[PDB]
Design a protein around this ligand. Sequence first.
Ligand SMILES: *[C@@H]1O[C@H](CO)[C@@H](O)[C@H](O)[C@H]1NC(C)=O
Lengths: 38, 33
Amino acid sequence: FNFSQILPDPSKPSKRSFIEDLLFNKVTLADAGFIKDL
Amino acid sequence: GTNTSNQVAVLYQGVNCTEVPVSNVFQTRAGCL
Ligand SMILES: *[C@@H]1O[C@H](CO)[C@@H](O)[C@H](O)[C@H]1NC(C)=O
């Protein structure tokens, strides 16, 4: 059984795995930084 | 909690506190420590 896609890839910048990254990008939401949606 | 000591530390919520900090400054994604 090849759990390649789900198991976190070390080379990937974010510790997120292939499937995890795809998910995050789809939802249009990324508040990078909180020093202050509008 | 007063039962141990009476020293406390301060946190400002939204500030580039390098700039408007109004000893021992230290910058966090959550503000000024
Ligand atoms: C605070 O302001 C300085 C001014 O250049 C900037 O370099 C620094 O990144 C700022 N702090 C944050 C957390 O963005």
